[PDB]
Amino acid sequence: MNRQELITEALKARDMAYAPYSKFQVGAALLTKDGKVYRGCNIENAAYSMCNCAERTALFKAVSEGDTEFQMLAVAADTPGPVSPCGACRQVISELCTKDVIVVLTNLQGQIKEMTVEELLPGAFSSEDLH
Amino acid sequence: MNRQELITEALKARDMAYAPYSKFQVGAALLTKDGKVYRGCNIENAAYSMCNCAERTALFKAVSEGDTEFQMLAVAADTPGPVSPCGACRQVISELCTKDVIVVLTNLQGQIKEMTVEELLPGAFSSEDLH
């Protein structure tokens, strides 16, 4: 499961999105250390605050199944450049993924940006800050 | 899969919760029309706003897999009476579940309250309100 293949997983996951308000579909594929893939997509709500993102859908799915060791996360959307995870997703990612996990961002036209969890949100607010 | 059995599913799902800040674990089990069960649990974050609930974890998991027809949702937590879904969950439920879906609420001591999606959030804000 290289990043190329993980991207195709996120592209497929994108087609499952429920986004009738923004008409903006997002897909994500999370790869565990054991090689298992969890797909995620954004799921909207008439009350915008309750919309959930593809990145978080995939992570929530994994953690709920007991999988908490990851190696890579691919995210895709029909944006101008590689899709940029929103702050809420970066925050959840910084909590649920170890700082070494690779984050692969792409769009639907071959644009690819790769960065680590730490780079996605440097100095992220964490539990250590609470105590 | 009766409500008794769906409750045991939610009780198991509760043990998967990642809740190091509140130490309050919640479990949920969503039953589709075809009899498939999706488990969900709350997943917290040092930045409280980003915490996700068991009800929504289960629903997000189902919808992302392509399952959008449900019949029942069980929710469980160690509360005094049947656990009460927070407003955000009721909002997502009212969007992703048809008004006839049965919502079963319970705690860890046999308290059981049953209600429909419509009753969970009567006159819920919806897409019809946007247009």
Added chain:
Amino acid sequence: MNRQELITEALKARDMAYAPYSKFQVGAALLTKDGKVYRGCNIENAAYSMCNCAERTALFKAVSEGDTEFQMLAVAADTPGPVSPCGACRQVISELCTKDVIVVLTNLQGQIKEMTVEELLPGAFSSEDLH
């Protein structure tokens, strides 16, 4: 400050809304026991999850100023019937307003529905449930 006058306050507050994504403006006016009025409006974000509602904007404003005793909350939007607070707002309302506070819901055509905080979200999840 009767409900009629508080409604006009919410109608004015609605014109301050920043809602370029939904084009759906909402207004709210919160009346304290001492007769002070706090206006609120929805404020959106390209990343939908981060949108904030009029009801919560008004409440957040009041609480931050040290005002925590309220008597009435008016909410208005261009909906078919009285605007329905989303679950997230009902949740925050049930926490920050005592159960006796009156919630006045209306649209832009004279539709008016009045209910108490308790009625807005009966048996709302609360701190008592955490401990």
Added chain:
Amino acid sequence: MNRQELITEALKARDMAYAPYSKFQVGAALLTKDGKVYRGCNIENAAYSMCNCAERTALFKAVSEGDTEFQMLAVAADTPGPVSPCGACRQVISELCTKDVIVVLTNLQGQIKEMTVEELLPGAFSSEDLH
């Protein structure tokens, strides 16, 4: 109103926080181009997802009043180093503040980190990505 004075404003705003669940109070002070200061503080909810942060409380307050031109934002909390805005706040900040606005982060022991909005969340997801 230099950053030193804006910090004292955020320190005062911190004392208004309603944070009975985390016992972690945060303060913020937003300075407009015209020299007006809006204070903000975190406001929690038994249902963690609904908690709101100091940064966003201040911004929501300003925007609702019609003030949309800012020059600086100070944030303070009792953290080990300068308090780090959570992803949700950085997201709202990148939307409501122009990329040149100065963000001043500090704790209660003189630690000070200064950065621009762009630096707070480089390449933030924006409306341009939606269309």
